[PDB]
Coordinates of C-alpha atoms in Angstrom, one line a residue:
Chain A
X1 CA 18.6 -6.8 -6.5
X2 CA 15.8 -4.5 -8.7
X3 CA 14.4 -1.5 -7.2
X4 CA 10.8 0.2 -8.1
X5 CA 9.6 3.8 -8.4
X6 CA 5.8 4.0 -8.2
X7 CA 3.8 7.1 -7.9
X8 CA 0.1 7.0 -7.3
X9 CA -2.4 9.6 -7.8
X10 CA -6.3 9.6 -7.0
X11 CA -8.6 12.1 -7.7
X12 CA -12.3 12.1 -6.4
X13 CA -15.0 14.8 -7.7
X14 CA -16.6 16.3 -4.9
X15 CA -20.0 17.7 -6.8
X16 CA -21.6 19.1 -3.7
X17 CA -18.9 22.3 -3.6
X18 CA -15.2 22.8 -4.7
X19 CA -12.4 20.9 -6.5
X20 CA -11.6 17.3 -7.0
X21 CA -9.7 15.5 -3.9
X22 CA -6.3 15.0 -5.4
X23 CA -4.0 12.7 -3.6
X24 CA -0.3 12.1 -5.2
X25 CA 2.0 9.5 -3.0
X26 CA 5.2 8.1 -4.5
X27 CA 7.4 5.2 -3.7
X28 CA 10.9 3.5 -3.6
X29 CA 10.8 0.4 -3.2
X30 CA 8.3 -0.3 -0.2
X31 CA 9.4 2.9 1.3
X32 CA 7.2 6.3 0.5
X33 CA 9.3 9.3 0.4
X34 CA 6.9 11.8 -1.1
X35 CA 3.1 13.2 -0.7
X36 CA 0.6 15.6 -2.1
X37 CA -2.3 16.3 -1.0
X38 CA -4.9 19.2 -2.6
X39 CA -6.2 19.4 1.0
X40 CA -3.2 19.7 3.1
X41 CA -1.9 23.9 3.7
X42 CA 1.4 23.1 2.3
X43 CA 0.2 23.0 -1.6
X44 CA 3.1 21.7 -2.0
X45 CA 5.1 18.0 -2.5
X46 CA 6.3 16.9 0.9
X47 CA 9.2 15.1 2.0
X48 CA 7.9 11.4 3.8
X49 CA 11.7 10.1 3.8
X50 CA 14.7 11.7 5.2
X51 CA 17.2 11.1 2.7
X52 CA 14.5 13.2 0.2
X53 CA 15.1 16.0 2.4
X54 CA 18.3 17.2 1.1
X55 CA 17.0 18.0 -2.4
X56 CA 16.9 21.8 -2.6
X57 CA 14.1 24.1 -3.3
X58 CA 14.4 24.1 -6.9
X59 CA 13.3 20.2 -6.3
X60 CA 10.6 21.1 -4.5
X61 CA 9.4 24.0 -6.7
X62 CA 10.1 21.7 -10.0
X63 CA 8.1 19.0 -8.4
X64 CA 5.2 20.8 -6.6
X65 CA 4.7 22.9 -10.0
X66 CA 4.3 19.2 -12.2
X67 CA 2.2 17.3 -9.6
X68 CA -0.3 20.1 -9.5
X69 CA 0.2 20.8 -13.1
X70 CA -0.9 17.0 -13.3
X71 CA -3.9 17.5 -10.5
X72 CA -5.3 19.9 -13.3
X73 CA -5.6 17.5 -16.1
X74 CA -7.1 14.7 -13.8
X75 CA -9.9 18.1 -12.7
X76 CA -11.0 18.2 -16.5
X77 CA -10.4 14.4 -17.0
X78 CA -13.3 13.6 -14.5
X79 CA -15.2 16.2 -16.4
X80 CA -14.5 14.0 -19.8
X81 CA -15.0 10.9 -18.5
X82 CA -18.6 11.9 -17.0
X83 CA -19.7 13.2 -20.6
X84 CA -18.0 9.5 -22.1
X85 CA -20.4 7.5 -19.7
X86 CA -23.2 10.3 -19.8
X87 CA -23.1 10.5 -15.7
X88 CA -24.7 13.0 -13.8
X89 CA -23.2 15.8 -12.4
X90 CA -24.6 14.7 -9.1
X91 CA -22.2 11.7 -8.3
X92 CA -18.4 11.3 -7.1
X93 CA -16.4 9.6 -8.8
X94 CA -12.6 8.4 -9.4
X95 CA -9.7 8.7 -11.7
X96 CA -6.5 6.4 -10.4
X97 CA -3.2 6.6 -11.6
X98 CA 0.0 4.5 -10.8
X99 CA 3.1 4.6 -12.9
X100 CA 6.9 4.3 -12.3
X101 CA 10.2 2.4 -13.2
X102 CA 11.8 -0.7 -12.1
X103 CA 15.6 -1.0 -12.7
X104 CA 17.7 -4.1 -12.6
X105 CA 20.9 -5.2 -10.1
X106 CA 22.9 -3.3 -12.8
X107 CA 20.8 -0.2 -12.3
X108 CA 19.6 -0.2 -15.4
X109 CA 16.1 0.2 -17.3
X110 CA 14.3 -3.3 -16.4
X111 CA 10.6 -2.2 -17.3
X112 CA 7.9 0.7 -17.2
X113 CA 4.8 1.1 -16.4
X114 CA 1.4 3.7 -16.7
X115 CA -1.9 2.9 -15.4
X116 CA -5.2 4.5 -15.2
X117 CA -8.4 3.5 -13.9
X118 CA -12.1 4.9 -13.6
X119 CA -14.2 4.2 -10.6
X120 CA -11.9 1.1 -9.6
X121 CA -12.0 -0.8 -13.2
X122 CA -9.7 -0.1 -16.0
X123 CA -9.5 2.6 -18.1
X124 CA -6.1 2.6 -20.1
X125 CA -2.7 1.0 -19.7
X126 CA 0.5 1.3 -21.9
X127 CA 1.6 -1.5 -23.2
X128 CA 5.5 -3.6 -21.9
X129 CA 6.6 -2.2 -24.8
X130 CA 5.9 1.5 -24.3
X131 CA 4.7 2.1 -27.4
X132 CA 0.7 1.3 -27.3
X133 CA -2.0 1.7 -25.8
X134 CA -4.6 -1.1 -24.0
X135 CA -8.2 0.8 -23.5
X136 CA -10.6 -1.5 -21.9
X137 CA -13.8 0.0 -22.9
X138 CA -15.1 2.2 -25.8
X139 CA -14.9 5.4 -23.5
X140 CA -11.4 4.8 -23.2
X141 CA -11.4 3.8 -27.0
X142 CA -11.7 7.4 -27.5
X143 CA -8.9 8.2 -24.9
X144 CA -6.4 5.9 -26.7
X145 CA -7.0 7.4 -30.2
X146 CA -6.1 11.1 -29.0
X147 CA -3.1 9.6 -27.2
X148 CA -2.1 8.1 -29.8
X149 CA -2.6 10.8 -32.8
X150 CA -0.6 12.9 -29.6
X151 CA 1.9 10.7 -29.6
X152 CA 1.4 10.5 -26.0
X153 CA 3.4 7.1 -25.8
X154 CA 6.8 8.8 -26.8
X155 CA 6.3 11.1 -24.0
X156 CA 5.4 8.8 -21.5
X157 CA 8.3 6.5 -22.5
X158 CA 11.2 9.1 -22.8
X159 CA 10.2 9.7 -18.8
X160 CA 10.4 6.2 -18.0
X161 CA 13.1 5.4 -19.5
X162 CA 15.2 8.5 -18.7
X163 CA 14.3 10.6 -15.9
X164 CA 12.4 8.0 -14.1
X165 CA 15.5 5.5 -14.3
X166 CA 18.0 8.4 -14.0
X167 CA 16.5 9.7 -10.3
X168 CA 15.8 6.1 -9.2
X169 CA 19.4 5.9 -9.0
X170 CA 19.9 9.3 -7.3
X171 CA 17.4 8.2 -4.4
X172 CA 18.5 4.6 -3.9
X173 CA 22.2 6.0 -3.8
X174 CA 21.6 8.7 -1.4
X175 CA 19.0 6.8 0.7
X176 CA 21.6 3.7 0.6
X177 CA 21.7 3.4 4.4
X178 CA 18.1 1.9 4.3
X179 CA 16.9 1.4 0.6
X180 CA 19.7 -0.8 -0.4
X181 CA 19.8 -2.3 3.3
X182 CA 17.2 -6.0 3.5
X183 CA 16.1 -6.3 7.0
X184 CA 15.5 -10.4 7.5
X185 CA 12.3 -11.1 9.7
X186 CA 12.4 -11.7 13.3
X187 CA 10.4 -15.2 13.4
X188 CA 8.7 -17.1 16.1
X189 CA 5.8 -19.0 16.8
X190 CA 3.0 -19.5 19.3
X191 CA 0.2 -22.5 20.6
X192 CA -3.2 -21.7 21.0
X193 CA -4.9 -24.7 22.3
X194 CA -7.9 -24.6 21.3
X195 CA -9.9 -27.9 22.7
X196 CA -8.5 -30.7 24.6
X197 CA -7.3 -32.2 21.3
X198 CA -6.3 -29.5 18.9
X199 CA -3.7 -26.4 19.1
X200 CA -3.7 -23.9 16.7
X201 CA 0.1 -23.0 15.5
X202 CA 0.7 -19.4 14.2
X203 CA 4.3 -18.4 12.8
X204 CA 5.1 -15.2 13.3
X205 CA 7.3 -12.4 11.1
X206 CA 7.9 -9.1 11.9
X207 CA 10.3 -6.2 11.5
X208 CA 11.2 -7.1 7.9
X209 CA 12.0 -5.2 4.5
X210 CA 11.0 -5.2 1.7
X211 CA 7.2 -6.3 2.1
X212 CA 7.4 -9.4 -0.1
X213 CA 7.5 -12.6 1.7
X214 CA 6.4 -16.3 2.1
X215 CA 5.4 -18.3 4.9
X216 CA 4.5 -22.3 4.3
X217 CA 3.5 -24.7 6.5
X218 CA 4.8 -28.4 6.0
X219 CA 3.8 -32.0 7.2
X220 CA 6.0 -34.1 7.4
X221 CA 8.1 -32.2 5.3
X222 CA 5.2 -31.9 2.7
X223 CA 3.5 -28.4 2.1
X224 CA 0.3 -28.3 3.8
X225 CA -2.7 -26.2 3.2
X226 CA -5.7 -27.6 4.5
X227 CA -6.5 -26.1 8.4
X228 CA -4.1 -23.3 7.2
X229 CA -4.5 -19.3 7.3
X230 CA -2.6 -16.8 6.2
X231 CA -3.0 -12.8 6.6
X232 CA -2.2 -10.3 4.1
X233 CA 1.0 -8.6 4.7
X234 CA 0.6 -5.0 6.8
X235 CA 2.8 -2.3 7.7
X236 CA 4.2 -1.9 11.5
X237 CA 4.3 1.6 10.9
X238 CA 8.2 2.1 11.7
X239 CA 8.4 1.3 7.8
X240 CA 9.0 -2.7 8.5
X241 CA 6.3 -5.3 7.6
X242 CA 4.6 -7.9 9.5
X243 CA 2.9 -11.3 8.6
X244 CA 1.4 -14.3 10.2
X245 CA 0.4 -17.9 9.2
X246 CA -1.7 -20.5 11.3
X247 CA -1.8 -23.9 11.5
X248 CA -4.5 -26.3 13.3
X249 CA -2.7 -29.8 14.7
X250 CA -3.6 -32.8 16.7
X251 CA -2.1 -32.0 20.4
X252 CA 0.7 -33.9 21.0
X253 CA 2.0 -33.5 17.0
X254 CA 3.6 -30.6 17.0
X255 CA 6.9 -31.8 16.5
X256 CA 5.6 -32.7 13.1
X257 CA 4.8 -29.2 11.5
X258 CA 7.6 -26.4 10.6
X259 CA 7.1 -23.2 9.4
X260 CA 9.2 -22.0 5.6
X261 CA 10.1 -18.5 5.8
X262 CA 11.5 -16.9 2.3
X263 CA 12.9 -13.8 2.0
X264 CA 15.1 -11.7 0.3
X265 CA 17.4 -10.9 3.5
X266 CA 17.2 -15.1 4.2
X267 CA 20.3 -16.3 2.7
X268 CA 18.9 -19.4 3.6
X269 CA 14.5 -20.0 4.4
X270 CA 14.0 -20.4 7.5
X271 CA 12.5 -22.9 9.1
X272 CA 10.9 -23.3 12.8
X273 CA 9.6 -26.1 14.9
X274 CA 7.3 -26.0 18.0
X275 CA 10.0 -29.0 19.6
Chain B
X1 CA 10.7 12.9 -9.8
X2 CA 7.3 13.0 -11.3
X3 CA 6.0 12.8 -14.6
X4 CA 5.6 15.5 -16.7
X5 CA 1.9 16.5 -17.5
X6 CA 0.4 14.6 -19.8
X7 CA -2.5 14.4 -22.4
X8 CA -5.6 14.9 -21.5
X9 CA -8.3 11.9 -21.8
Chain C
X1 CA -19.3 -3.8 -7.3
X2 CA -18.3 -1.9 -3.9
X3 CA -15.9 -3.2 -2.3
X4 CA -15.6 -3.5 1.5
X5 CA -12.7 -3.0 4.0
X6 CA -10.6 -5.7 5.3
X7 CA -9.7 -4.5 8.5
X8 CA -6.6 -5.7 10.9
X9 CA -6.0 -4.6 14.0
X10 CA -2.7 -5.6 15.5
X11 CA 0.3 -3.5 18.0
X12 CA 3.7 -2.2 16.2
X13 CA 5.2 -4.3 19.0
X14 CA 4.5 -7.2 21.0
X15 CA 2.2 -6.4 23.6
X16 CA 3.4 -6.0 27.0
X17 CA 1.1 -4.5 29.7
X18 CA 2.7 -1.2 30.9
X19 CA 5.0 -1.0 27.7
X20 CA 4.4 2.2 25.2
X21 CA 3.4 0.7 21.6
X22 CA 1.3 1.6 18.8
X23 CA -1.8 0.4 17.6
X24 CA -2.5 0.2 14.6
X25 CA -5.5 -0.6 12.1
X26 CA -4.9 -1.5 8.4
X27 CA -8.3 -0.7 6.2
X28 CA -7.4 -2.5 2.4
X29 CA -9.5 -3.9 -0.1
X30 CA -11.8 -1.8 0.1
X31 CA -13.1 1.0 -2.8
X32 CA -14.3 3.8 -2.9
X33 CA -11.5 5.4 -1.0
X34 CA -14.0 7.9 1.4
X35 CA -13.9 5.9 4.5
X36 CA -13.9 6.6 8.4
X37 CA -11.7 4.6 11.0
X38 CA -11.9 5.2 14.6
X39 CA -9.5 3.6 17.0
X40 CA -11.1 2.9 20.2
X41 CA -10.5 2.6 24.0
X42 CA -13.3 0.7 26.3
X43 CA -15.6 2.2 23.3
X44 CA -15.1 5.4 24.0
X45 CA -12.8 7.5 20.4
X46 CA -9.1 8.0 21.1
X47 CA -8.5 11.5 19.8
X48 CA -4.8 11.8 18.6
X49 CA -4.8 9.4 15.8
X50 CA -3.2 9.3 12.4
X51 CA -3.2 7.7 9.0
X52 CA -1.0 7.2 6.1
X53 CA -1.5 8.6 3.0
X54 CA -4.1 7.1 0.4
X55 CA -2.2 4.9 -1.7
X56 CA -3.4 1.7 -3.5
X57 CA -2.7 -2.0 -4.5
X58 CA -2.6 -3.5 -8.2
X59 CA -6.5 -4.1 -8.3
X60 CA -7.3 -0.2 -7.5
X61 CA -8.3 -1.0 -4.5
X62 CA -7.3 1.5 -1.5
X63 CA -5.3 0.8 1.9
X64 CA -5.0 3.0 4.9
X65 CA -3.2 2.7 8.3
X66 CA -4.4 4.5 11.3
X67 CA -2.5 4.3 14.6
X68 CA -1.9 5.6 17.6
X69 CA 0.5 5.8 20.4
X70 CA -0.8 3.6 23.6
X71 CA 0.0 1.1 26.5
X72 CA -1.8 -2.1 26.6
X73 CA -3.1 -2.8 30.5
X74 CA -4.7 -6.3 30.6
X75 CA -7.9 -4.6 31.8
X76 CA -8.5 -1.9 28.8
X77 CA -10.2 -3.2 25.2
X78 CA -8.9 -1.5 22.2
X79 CA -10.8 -2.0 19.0
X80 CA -11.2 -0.3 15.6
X81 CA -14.3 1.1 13.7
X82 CA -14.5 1.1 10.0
X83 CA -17.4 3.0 8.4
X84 CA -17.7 2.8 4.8
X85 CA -20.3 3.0 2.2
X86 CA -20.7 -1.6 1.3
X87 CA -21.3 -1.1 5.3
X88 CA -25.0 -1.2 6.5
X89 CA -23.8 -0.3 9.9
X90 CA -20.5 0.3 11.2
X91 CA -18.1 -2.5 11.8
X92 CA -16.1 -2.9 15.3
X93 CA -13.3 -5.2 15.2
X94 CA -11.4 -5.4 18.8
X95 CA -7.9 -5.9 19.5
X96 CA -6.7 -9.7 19.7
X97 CA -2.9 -9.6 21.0
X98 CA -2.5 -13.4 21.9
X99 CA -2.8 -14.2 18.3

């Protein structure tokens, strides 16, 4: 199917002493496989995936010299934007970036993305088409003109389009074993009685890959929602996913509820049954 | 791979 | 204009007194990204813990997972504390296997 490379940065001012936090993570897929971190002894980019490793030093030296090269600009950003908004110097605050490619099932160029943000709301956003600019507020109004007189677009899009699709490939190739592996949920589901006339019902899936899945609840065979719950999605930690949904039911009408479970290593849903 | 740097704001 | 931490706290495994796990607890939603988690055992801070690194969802907000190695006993309470600035006091939410 498509594939994703996402990198995201944040930098935080830190005006009692020093340099802005700068925090660079990036992504195949749901699976991280690099890290920077301005605080860590390394100053360097670190591996976080094993099939990463096996780039050699010039990798490391190309891509640790960039990402602090970047860390820089995002230093005398936070100085910019503070002037834009006429902030003190007293207060932290936040620049966000998150960028990256998505290919198709053909490997090929599917869409692009750059994204920036200021204290958690937007700031500025290229366009589907790569070539302009969304600012959301007259600070970033400013932004978009120099970027644009810069021809910062062009730049940005010969990256996404060409390194950023080229290396995709590279990763998903030599981390095949589990990047272009799915790993189907592991379901089951347990009663929770919780009076002598209702049981709560909670369908369970763990241990899958990638992240994006659906659980639904049906009636009768029709999709229910009321006495429903549903947690976000979280990580296990071993690089697998886990999520749950919940259903309260008369005791006694069990049989009638089953539990949907879509995803991407389901050839078919799935569907339980407390029988 | 990252990036390049870009424009400042 | 803050926004606060949801916080789950949940084992890598199902839990099995006696069986080495992990347990875990996911901070997301929340922004700005300082924050402090504490994992703990019988109320008391477990020492060797870890977190991901700072990464963050479509909406800028920030997620975190801190976890540590441990074995559920039937008789220990495991919780997590989450202490971040939308919070007037810090928040304690305990381990629930059974759900």
């Amino acid at each position: 199917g498509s594939h994703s490379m996402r990198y995201f940065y944040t930098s935080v001012s830190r005006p009692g002493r020093g340099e802005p936090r700068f925090i660079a993570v990036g992504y195949v897929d749901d699976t991280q496989f690099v890290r920077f971190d301005s605080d860590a002894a390394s100053q360097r980019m670190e591996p976080r995936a094993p099939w990463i490793e096996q780039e050699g030093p010039e990798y490391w030296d190309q891509e640790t010299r960039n990402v602090k090269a970047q860390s820089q600009t995002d230093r005398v950003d936070l100085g910019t934007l503070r002037g834009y908004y006429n902030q003190s110097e007293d207060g932290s605050h936040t620049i966000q970036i998150m960028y990256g490619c998505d290919v198709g099932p053909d490997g090929r160029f599917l869409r692009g993305y750059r994204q920036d943000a200021y204290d958690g709301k937007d700031y500025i956003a290229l366009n589907e088409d790569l070539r302009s600019w969304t600012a959301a507020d007259m600070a970033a109004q400013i932004t978009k003109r120099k970027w644009e007189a810069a021809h910062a677009a062009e730049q940005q899009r010969a990256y996404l389009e060409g390194r950023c699709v080229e290396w995709l490939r590279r990763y998903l190739e030599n981390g095949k074993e589990t990047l272009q592996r799915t790993d189907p949920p592991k379901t089951h589901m347990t009663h929770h009685p919780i009076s002598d006339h209702e049981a709560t019902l909670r369908c369970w899936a763990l241990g899958f890959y990638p992240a994006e899945i659906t659980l639904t609840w049906q009636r009768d065979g029709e999709d229910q929602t009321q006495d429903t719950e549903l947690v976000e999605t979280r990580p296990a930690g071993d690089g697998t996913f886990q999520k749950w949904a919940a259903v309260v039911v008369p005791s006694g009408e069990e049989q009638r509820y089953t539990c949907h479970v879509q995803h991407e290593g389901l050839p078919k849903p799935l569907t339980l049954r407390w029988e | 791979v990252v990036g390049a740097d870009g424009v400042g704001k | 204009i803050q926004r606060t931490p949801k916080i789950q706290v949940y084992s890598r495994h199902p839990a099995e007194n006696g069986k080495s796990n992990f347990l875990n607890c996911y901070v997301s939603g929340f922004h700005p990204s300082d924050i402090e988690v504490d994992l703990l055992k019988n109320g008391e801070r477990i020492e060797k813990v870890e977190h991901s690194d700072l990464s963050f969802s479509k909406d800028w907000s920030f997620y975190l997972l801190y976890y540590t190695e441990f074995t559920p006993t039937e008789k220990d309470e495991y919780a997590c504390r989450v202490n971040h600035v939308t919070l007037s006091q810090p928040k304690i939410v305990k381990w629930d296997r059974d759900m």
